Structure formats: structure tokens, C-alpha cells
Design a protein around this ligand. Structure first.
Ligand SMILES: *C/C=C(C)/C=C/C=C(C)/C=C/C1=C(C)CCCC1(C)C
Ligand SMILES: CCCCCCCCCCCCCCCCCCCC
Ligand SMILES: CCCCCCCCCCCCCCCCCCCC
Ligand SMILES: CCCCCCCCCCCCCCCCCCCC
Ligand SMILES: CCCCCCCCCCCCCCCCCCCC
Ligand SMILES: CCCCCCCCCCCCCCCCCCCC
Ligand SMILES: CCCCCCCCCCCCCCCCCCCC
Ligand SMILES: CCCCCCCCCCCCCCCCCCCC
Ligand SMILES: CCCCCCCCCCCCCCCCCCCC
Ligand SMILES: CCCCCCCCCCCCCCCCCCCC
Length: 217
């Protein structure tokens, strides 16, 4: 398990870089007015690339720092919401949701960090899990309600974005609890890594697809 976890960190590092530069190279495929989300998706993968290089080194040392993962999350999750909410909102409605969902994400990630750095299975560990889970469910319920009025190819492309988040983000609470299900500390890190690749590279691909649709392709 320890070597598998290291290898996955190394592969994910190159994968985040590939996502970054793939998305940048692909921006010419859509109209200028629809490139912003693609560029933000590239920024998300680029920040992740930076932190994945650090996480692989940290894991390899034998004294791993989950703070690297959590700082990456706290910076990137609000950016992902910026991309999502721009599809359905502008102006006042956009500003309100970006702020409120960003605050919620920060609470979720901070509660998780508090719990994960507590003794596994302790009241503190479960306190962080429960607070994070409630905030997560609030976010997912808000997301489900977004764009329910859309029709046509834009509706389908937005539903694909929503579904990636609604399904893919379940991996994170599963990773968080893995170490109390078995001798699975490394499996937490495996699951977080797989999740970050799926969610960050996948969202970028789907934001690019949305931009193709918005461009009339
Ligand atoms: C790019 C990274 C992403 C999208 C990270 C997402 C992280 C989460 C949705 C984390 C959620 C958690 C819970 C719902 C409960 C346990 C604590 C967390 C922070 C792992
Ligand atoms: C036109 C295509 C735009 C891509 C520009 C990306 C360059 C900046 C990346 C960071 C260095
Ligand atoms: C018309 C404007 C075109 C320029 C947009 C370029 C935006 C690229 C942003 C992503 C680059 C990320 C590079 C790695 C980040 C390192 C984190 C520290
Ligand atoms: C130690 C006592 C706490 C055990 C119960 C925590 C389970 C929470 C599941 C959500
Ligand atoms: C913080 C624990 C309760 C979970 C529900 C989250 C409430 C909404 C987030 C505040 C931003 C407005
Ligand atoms: C551990 C593996 C977990 C797999 C999660 C799969 C994520 C679901 C993505 C939803 C599909 C949206 C893509 C639309 C096609 C374009
Ligand atoms: C126990 C909660 C998970 C139910 C199945 C959905 C998991 C999807 C992971 C991708
Ligand atoms: C150990 C008890 C905790 C329950 C596991 C929850 C895992 C996350 C699933 C949330 C999906 C909604
Ligand atoms: C963990 C194994 C990965 C296999 C499932 C990949 C999930 C696809 C994510 C959807 C975005 C790309 C659309 C095609
Ligand atoms: C354009 C084709 C891009 C395919 C990438 C889809 C995979 C998403 C990340 C998980 C693997």
C-alpha cells in the first residue's frame, strides 16, 4: 500500500500538469467569450500540480503532511464553484452564490482538517466529519437546484457538470473514513488522489465541453 500510494502521487502530479496544459492548448477551440471557465479550470489543475509535487515528496519522506492536501482544497474548491455558477448566474445572483458557497466550502474543508488531524475515531475526528458532512450536503442540495430551468444542449452539458460533482465528490468522505474501516491510512490518501484527478481534470474537460456548446458547436 505505501508504494502504491507513492506511485499514485507521482502519476497524479504529471496528470495535473497534463490537465493544466491540455486545457490551455484547448482554449483556442472555443470562442473567446467562453474561454474564462477553461482558463480557471487550467488554474485549478495548475495549483493542484504545485501541491501534488509537494505531497509526493512529503509521502515519500515517511512524515506526510495532509495540510498540503487541505490547503490545495481550500484554494481550488471556490474556483470550481466560480466556474459552475457562471453558467447559471451573473451580477447579483452570481456574487451571492459564489460568496455563500465559498464560505460553506471553507467551513467544510476546515472542519475536515480539524477532524483528520485529531486522533482517528475520537470525538474530535467525528465532530469534524459531521460538520463537514452537513456543509457538504448543503452545498450538494444547492448544486442540484442550480440550472433546473435550462433546456437543450446547454442543459445536458450543465447536468454533466453537476453529476460529476454530485457523484465524484462522494469519494472524499469515503477516504476520510477509510482509516476507521481497516488498517487503511494509506487508502485514505489513495482515494483523495484518485478523487482529485477525476474531479479536477474531469471538471475541466466538462467545462471545455460546456464552452464548445456555448460557442455553438
Ligand atoms: C479539488 C478538490 C476537491 C473538489 C475537494 C473536495 C473535498 C471535499 C468535498 C471534502 C469533503 C469532506 C467531507 C464531506 C467529510 C470529511 C471531511 C472532508 C473535508 C474530506
Ligand atoms: C492563446 C492561448 C492562451 C494560452 C496562454 C497560457 C500561458 C500562461 C501559462 C502560465 C505560464
Ligand atoms: C486573453 C487572456 C489569456 C491568458 C489566460 C491565461 C491563464 C492561465 C492560468 C493557468 C496557469 C497555471 C500555471 C500553474 C500554476 C502554479 C500555481 C502556483
Ligand atoms: C467515539 C464515539 C463516537 C462513535 C459514533 C460516531 C459515528 C458517526 C457517524 C456519522
Ligand atoms: C456549519 C454547519 C451547518 C451546515 C450548514 C451550512 C450553512 C450554510 C453555510 C453558510 C453560508 C451562507
Ligand atoms: C472511484 C471511481 C469513481 C467514479 C466516479 C465517476 C464520476 C461520474 C461522472 C459523471 C458523468 C459526467 C460525464 C458526462 C460525459 C461527457
Ligand atoms: C456509502 C455511500 C456511497 C454509495 C455509492 C456511491 C459512491 C460513488 C463514488 C464515486
Ligand atoms: C461510518 C459512518 C459514516 C457514513 C459514511 C458516509 C460516507 C459519505 C457518503 C455521503 C453521500 C451522500
Ligand atoms: C478512477 C478510475 C477512473 C475511471 C472513471 C473516470 C471518470 C470520468 C470523469 C468524467 C469527465 C470526463 C468525461 C468523459
Ligand atoms: C479531450 C479528451 C480528454 C479526456 C480526459 C478525460 C479523463 C478525465 C480525468 C480522469 C481520467
Amino acid at each position: 500500500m505505501e508504494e502504491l500510494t507513492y506511485r499514485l502521487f507521482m502519476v497524479a502530479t504529471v496528470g495535473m500538469l497534463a490537465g493544466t496544459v491540455f486545457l490551455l492548448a484547448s482554449s483556442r477551440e472555443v470562442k473567446p467569450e467562453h474561454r474564462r471557465g477553461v482558463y480557471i479550470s487550467a488554474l485549478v489543475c495548475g495549483i493542484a500540480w504545485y501541491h501534488y509535487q509537494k505531497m509526493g515528496a512529503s509521502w515519500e519522506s515517511g512524515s506526510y503532511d495532509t495540510g498540503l492536501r487541505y490547503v490545495d482544497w481550500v484554494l481550488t474548491v471556490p474556483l470550481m464553484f466560480v466556474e459552475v455558477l457562471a453558467v447559471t448566474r451573473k451580477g447579483a445572483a452570481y456574487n451571492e452564490a459564489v460568496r455563500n458557497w465559498g464560505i460553506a466550502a471553507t467551513v467544510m474543508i476546515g472542519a475536515g482538517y480539524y477532524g483528520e488531524t485529531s486522533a482517528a475515531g475520537s470525538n474530535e475526528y467525528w465532530t469534524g466529519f459531521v460538520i463537514a458532512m452537513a456543509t457538504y450536503v448543503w452545498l450538494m442540495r444547492n448544486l442540484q437546484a442550480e440550472g433546473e430551468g435550462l433546456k437543450g444542449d446547454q442543459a445536458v452539458a450543465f447536468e454533466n457538470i453537476k453529476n460529476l460533482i454530485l457523484v465524484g465528490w462522494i469519494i472524499y468522505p469515503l477516504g476520510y473514513i477509510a482509516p476507521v474501516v481497516g488498517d487503511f491510512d494509506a487508502i485514505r490518501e489513495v482515494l483523495y488522489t484518485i478523487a482529485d484527478i477525476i474531479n479536477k481534470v474531469g471538471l475541466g474537460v466538462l467545462v471545455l465541453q460546456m464552452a464548445r456548446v456555448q460557442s455553438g458547436e
